[PDB]
Amino acid sequence: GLPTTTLPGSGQFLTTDDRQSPSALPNYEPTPRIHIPGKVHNLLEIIQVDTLIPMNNTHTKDEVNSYLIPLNANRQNEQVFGTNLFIGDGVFKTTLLGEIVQYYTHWSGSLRFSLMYTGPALSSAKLILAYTPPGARGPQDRREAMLGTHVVWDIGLQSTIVMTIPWTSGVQFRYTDPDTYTSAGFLSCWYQTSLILPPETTGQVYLLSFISACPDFKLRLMKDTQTISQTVALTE
Amino acid sequence: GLPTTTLPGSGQFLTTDDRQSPSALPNYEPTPRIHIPGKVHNLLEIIQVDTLIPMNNTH
Amino acid sequence: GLPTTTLPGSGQFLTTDDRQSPSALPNYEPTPRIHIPGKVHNLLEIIQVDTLIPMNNTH
Amino acid sequence: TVASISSGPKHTQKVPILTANETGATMPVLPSDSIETRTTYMHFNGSETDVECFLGRAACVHVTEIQNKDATGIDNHREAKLFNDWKINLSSLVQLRKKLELFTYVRFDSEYTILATASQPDSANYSSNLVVQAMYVPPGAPNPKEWDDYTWQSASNPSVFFKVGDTSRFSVPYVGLASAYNCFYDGYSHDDAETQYGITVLNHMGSMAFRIVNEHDEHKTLVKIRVYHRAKHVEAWIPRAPRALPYTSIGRTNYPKNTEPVIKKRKGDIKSY
Amino acid sequence: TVASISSGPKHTQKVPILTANETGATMPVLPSDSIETRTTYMHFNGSETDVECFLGRAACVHVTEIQNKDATGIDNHREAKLFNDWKINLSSLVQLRKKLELFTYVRFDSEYTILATASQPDSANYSSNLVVQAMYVPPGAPNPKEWDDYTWQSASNPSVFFKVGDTSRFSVPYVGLASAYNCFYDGYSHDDAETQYGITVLNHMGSMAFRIVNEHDEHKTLVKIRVYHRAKHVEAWIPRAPRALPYTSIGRTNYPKNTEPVIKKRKGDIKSY
Amino acid sequence: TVASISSGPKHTQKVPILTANETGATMPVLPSDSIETRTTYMHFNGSETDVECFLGR
Amino acid sequence: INYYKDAASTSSAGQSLSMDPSKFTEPVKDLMLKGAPALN
Amino acid sequence: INYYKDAASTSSAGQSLSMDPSKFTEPVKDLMLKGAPALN
Amino acid sequence: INYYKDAASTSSAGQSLSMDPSKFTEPVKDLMLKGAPALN
Amino acid sequence: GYSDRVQQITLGNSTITTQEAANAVVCYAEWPEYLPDVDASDVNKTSKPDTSVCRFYTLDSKTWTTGSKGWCWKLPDALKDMGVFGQNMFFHSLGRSGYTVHVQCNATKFHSGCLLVVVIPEHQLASHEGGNVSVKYTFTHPGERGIDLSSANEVGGPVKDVLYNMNGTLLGNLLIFPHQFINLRTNNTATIVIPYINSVPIDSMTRHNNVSLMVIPIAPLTVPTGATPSLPITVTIAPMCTEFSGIRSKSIVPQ
């Protein structure tokens, strides 16, 4: 008989501990694995695939239309859309990125925001996208917007433009649930010159917008998502 | 005295676990084995012998 | 199963003991350290800096 | 590892930021393709986002309850909660469910922890000490009828006996019939016109069934069982869109009617911040 | 190591005891610069004044309380102490606080011990055996509303279940967002005119939230939770003046008005012994 | 270990499927003696049918 | 590691991995080859 | 040290440290180079 | 022997045995020698 | 002078040419291949009709109009009646296959509109009834007709709400599945190569569909002034590396 002493914590059950256990089914042989395409190893692998952002959130019931950012022909100087960058809330929240970020407490890294244009091929347009780093207000006019991170996008044969929100930060991690100290800025978009439709054409054209994370990205300290809850256990 | 911590499951009895136990009969000597024809090792050995099927179940 | 005996003191919590514990946050990666001037290692380092004595205590 | 390299002004014919998303790719664009950057290192590995880590902590998968009371004159033990069960499943309760259904096929060993606590809602002199016996009745085995049937002998079926207030823990290898468990299944068990659809048809694995071993004392004792499940040795294939609407049933994808808009409406314009 | 060397009479032009304190230095003067000494050795290392040792013992950081009782008809579990919480912090109670605030920035892993004891202030037949469940709701997670919400499933959030009367112990890595925790912060969360100042703005880390897993017995049971915290792997920068006045609030430096003189007045003259 | 070997059409004078059960033997006939098979491996050892396992709980 | 002195006290045995059904499936005195006629 | 005989009884697995998003982010048949035109 | 995988779970650290008060006691720009005049 | 843009796919006795492609997607970066022995279980030799089943079948055409919500086809169902592919299907116990899907929609440089073409492995549909109502067989086996998401709820059928993918997930996140867009201004076809994806090496072709192909208008069709307000969309699909096993009597399936 070897002398032992038990410490504080004996008998506790910590849902996060990782130890060995007896197998209830001694000697059982599991089914062989066969090959299946698509294996995922890290959630970091999947948040780099871009998905659509319901940017046009202004509706009243969920609709395919809140994915469409409208553009008006012949407007000059004006603003196309605006949003803050609380990736865990608001427009971002239902996107795959938003949806995964919510399983973690802290995030750090660059984001990739792209816009794909869908107007007739014989039209043309020049837009400016601007990222405003924390510390200033959402820009109120392009002059204000153009003094921060921006890209003049020229609509052409190449249909999409990929803007990166480079990680601009004092503190090396921000909280995914919106927090002030930790806030990330604003994203706005304005006409640089203006949309022009060809003859025989009319109305609004739309941009689709996507979001995905750069390879830069870090997420840490897992927790429970506000995105799902329940009141009684389900049954069959 | 070596410091320990006990985990969840301590004291449980799992009918399928396989561990050592003290022998109640210390030092006892079992009867020698003699040879007996017919030893079975796997149930897989015996399910290969065919047996009759009551196919005509209608009684 | 290895035979053990527990000694007096089992289960006690001594605020001054120093042992290992399971991490509640398995696999979490702490923020990198950056350099900060001023690191203290011993209280003996700081009690050698002189400070003023309110000698005139009479107020 | 560098998180960003140093990059300076650019005036090229080589534009990495113009792409064609119609192709289905997400081109790997970085901050340094469109602003001037400085070197910085990652200092991070992505350890805690590994799927083994993501699915590897215990989650509550089931809460049931049984009572110890005089069975004298009870015509239906099962019905008096003289013992109970759970035709197993893990779609049961929804926190872990949303996590698993981020994948289509999943393969893992399970580690179960079972916590049992007792309640004595009406006048008792004391708290008795009950031993629970949880046995797994794999489909086909002869399921059990009274709280003290021959079934409980469990001569071939793994069973664990632990005390109420304590916890039991053991781990079961991946028992799936195929190479992975289907998180989803767009099929039937056969081509009948009225058979059920989904996966409650594929996830037929019997069910665990608990009881108290103790005979009855003078008062009644409620024992409530909580089963926790931790995946170990995880393998996951084919990521899918996360669950947006609430769940209604174990094993079907169905959402409730007149549900509410899941996308938050802006308080303001598209232009609003 | 010598604590003092041998030194004899001196009649020099080299005076180590005259200095200019206006410079900000504390010149390293020793007994042997001004009296005749003999050799003596230190016999000591300064082991127990290491900051790891100074901050490394468990200190009580929080006492809370929850009760097990029939929740039937309770409109606000949180309010009935059917469960509770503590938006974490460690300025809470003052013994450990004065110790930490001897430094400006501090970095360490935490080891928590949680002791839970039960009380039955009014007539009970017995003492029941309750299991506590403490879960950490990191800000953003969906905080919990009743004592038996889906929240308690805690499928992604670390939770520990232990018995009242026992102790639970586990250790959490340094979870700070920056490189160190700020013991002080002369800033705001943004440049608003009315936002709060100090560090309660920076030390936003959710909070742990306890409950009893047991349903109710016939009597009521008070369970009082004490959280102890031990720093391990300590790193401290920039020493500061010790706290002289009493504390009034978690996270602000504020002292109470009409406080009392903190320097003891002489009973006698400056000349008094 | 192969569970089935590959086997193709047969037109022989050597018929493994005709036997005389009166002898008391169970002749070891396989799928590949009477249909055309493809190779497949066992992936299994028969561990949990060992008598030690069968009587050991 | 055995902690105990007696052999009965050790854990379960380990798989025969013996397996030879012929004592049961082919106990015939003159060997039968599959493919050759059963009765000659 | 494993104390148990079966593989299911061992603790959690250890980090894939595999990580290759291209099956998801770039499943295109003809390779796309960043910087070259998307559609030629 | 660490029984646990993560570094936070290990016991207390071990004595700095670093000790250098000069950042606090003599942060002067031009070095002062004891015995030499303070102000020249 | 090779462009990402022009392409030719020849499979069997049938060829497709597109002069306005946008590359092609190969699901999960894997190309269809036959079933290796190491992965095999059924001992039966399989049948590989090759060129008689691995050719291009063009399903009947759809009409995109300004009110369209989107269409959904299931595989192998959509092909249950195409030539010898279909016969083989009803006649063997098990079968396995990959596909090349080519979705076609041309317009002019004055039109606008953008379709999402996506392949979802194991697309288990939801009942519009809620609760645990099932979706009857016939409803998930529309055949070449596919399911029309702008048709009305029917009884025993699935829900046809587009912002929810017919299963409780948001349209916006379908992009995690192999997919390609058809943006009239860029593109005129979409091509996806689908490797066989299942948790078993071979399965039944009638009780289980292993992918749904979905074409969904996202930016509404906008025709030039006084143009007819609609465009046809055509889907052509070719089984590739098909294998059938366990031949017999010929399945009889509901309805």
Ligand SMILES: Cc1cc(CCCCCOc2ccc(C3=NCCO3)cc2Cl)on1
């Ligand atoms: C996905 C998914 C997850 C699951 C559940 C898998 C359950 C496997 C079998 O479960 C058990 C086997 C044995 C015991 C047991 N043996 C002795 C005591 O308990 C308990 C369980 Cl839950 O099914 N599909």
Ligand SMILES: Cc1cc(CCCCCOc2ccc(C3=NCCO3)cc2Cl)on1
């Ligand atoms: C200075 C200073 C000290 C602190 C407190 C740091 C607290 C870190 C997070 O705390 C916890 C994390 C997890 C658990 C926990 N997981 C399972 C059970 O408890 C408990 C706590 Cl207090 O903040 N600033």
